[PDB]
Design a protein around this ligand. Structure first.
Ligand SMILES: [Ca+2]
Ligand SMILES: [Ca+2]
Ligand SMILES: [Ca+2]
Ligand SMILES: [Ca+2]
Ligand SMILES: [Zn+2]
Length: 316
């Protein structure tokens, strides 16, 4: 919409108060004109038609419980855009400031959120397995990171390249969660998963086996479910990225950690310069080694740690 940029206030899914960028033109819309070609949030009104209606509000105050998921989808897409711009110098997901669109209230009792190739979509959850999925900043950044991958490596969604594609989304979702300093951790989706159980999450990067996902290449899933295990075998790469950052000894192999910032620089470089649509785990290892070589030198500690981490999860 064409109108005047302004700032409204609301409450997110977890009850926290936040300011959001809106546009005024008769109604106040969830349209943030301060980032790129804009961030736009739509109401899918419990249907599956997309994108639905651009979210309109009469007084620029978003404290209704129906407003919550829209507030957080809108706000956390702004934080993800800032992370990619300020840390990696990338303007939106295509690198040319493409508008970011999200729809919330998709379907009824829908336990998922996803990047469909053109925009983000978030269910409200059934209230037991999940609460509205846009309340998790790691979920929002995970999905939007699929858009970055689609415009760069283009990793196909199946078998090892799809597992890499999912791991990349977990890694960057976790880095965004650390960047916003929102009670950060190495788990995925803990803010919106099972509101009645404390301490759990959908997946763990620090110990993927806690939920039964593989943490070593010898335990990979070789069947056909989940497109060849894209959400299961991503644990092998998640564990490797956790080790590179944090260090540790895993199946007898010791890794010195180099921290999150270098982790993010190496993987972003590998993603935007060396991975291709059909890259497999062994090609990911070579891409990450080369990236760390480019940035820090072939005899750096950083290259050494990337090798040890992939050796520790059995990826040669
Ligand atoms: Ca209102
Ligand atoms: Ca957290
Ligand atoms: Ca998390
Ligand atoms: Ca829980
Ligand atoms: Zn994903």
């Amino acid at each position: 919409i064409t109108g005047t940029s302004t700032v409204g206030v609301g409450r997110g899914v977890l009850g926290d108060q936040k300011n959001i960028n809106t546009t005024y033109s008769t109604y106040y819309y969830l349209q943030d004109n301060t980032r790129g070609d804009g961030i736009f949030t739509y109401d899918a009104k419990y249907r599956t038609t997309l994108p639905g209606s651009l979210w309109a509000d009469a007084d620029n105050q978003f404290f209704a419980s129906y407003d919550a998921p829209a507030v957080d989808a809108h706000y956390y897409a702004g934080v993800t855009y800032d992370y990619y711009k300020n840390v990696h110098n990338r303007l939106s997901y295509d690198g040319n400031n493409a508008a970011i669109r999200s729809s919330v209230h998709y379907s009824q009792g829908y336990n998922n959120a996803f990047w469909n190739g053109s925009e983000m979509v978030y269910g409200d959850g059934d209230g037991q397995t999940f609460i509205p999925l846009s309340g998790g900043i790691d979920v929002v950044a995970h999905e939007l990171t699929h858009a970055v991958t689609d415009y760069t490596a283009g990793l196909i969604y199946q078998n090892e390249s799809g597992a890499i594609n999912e791991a990349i989304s977990d890694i960057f979702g976790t880095l965004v969660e650390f960047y916003a300093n929102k009670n950060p951790d190495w788990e995925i989706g803990e803010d919106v998963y099972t509101p009645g159980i404390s301490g759990d999450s959908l997946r763990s990067m620090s110990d993927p086996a806690k939920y039964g996902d593989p943490d070593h290449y010898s335990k990979r899933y070789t069947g056909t479910q989940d497109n060849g295990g894209v959400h299961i075998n991503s644990g092998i790469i998640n564990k490797a990225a956790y080790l590179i950052s944090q260090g540790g000894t895993h199946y007898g192999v010791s890794v010195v950690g180099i921290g999150r910032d270098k982790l993010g620089k190496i993987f972003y470089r590998a993603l935007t310069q060396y991975l291709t649509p059909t890259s497999n785990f062994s090609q990911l290892r070579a891409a990450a080694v080369q990236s760390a070589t480019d940035l820090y030198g072939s005899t750096s500690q950083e290259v050494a740690s990337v090798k040890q981490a992939f050796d520790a999860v059995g990826v040669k």
